[PDB]
Design a protein around this ligand. Sequence first.
Ligand SMILES: [Zn+2]
Ligand SMILES: [Zn+2]
Lengths: 114, 114
Amino acid sequence: DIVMTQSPDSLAVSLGERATINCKSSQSVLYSSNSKNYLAWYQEKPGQPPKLLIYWASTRESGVPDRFSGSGSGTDFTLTISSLQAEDVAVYYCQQYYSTPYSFGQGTKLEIKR
Amino acid sequence: DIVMTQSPDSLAVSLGERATINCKSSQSVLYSSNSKNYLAWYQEKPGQPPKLLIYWASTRESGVPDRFSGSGSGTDFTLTISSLQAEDVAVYYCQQYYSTPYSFGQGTKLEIKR
Ligand SMILES: [Zn+2]
Ligand SMILES: [Zn+2]
């Protein structure tokens, strides 16, 4: 059973500043056979379903802005936004697709400090 | 706690024929306030992370082929592929994003009968 835990639960930074959200999996999601991390990051904008941002722990999905980047390996991971944009207000989720059933973290609410 | 159950676990149809996969949530994922179903369908092609196909139970994501369509409401849902294409070989997952932590079904493997 893999449980995903995020930290913090919510945070706020001024526009243009960096934001950092962490995620921890109960078990390792690094597959030894291919040395890849089965971890993903989702962005859930207000009233919208979560959409894929990063997969394989650090591979950015197409169309996704350059300011988003994932890092980490094993059990500790980090989603970083280099420079916060207004449209980034959302709840960010981390997911392990290492073993079924695929599980999500409980989300970290990102807001901008006005 | 919401558990997603899929049926069958794997199936195969000849190219060009219809394929049907079912999903059932342990609790209702229909939100009374807006009358929307917080259900999604993901396609996981061989060695790739699951990608979003359908959300809001029947809304197709952009770029997704017209042959894919989701239906159902409440607890019973269905993913239908009108005419099976060769590139559709994959494991299909249904997800509830009604309540955290968002959960996935265990997947239904789709293959083509040669
Ligand atoms: Zn600051
Ligand atoms: Zn047939």
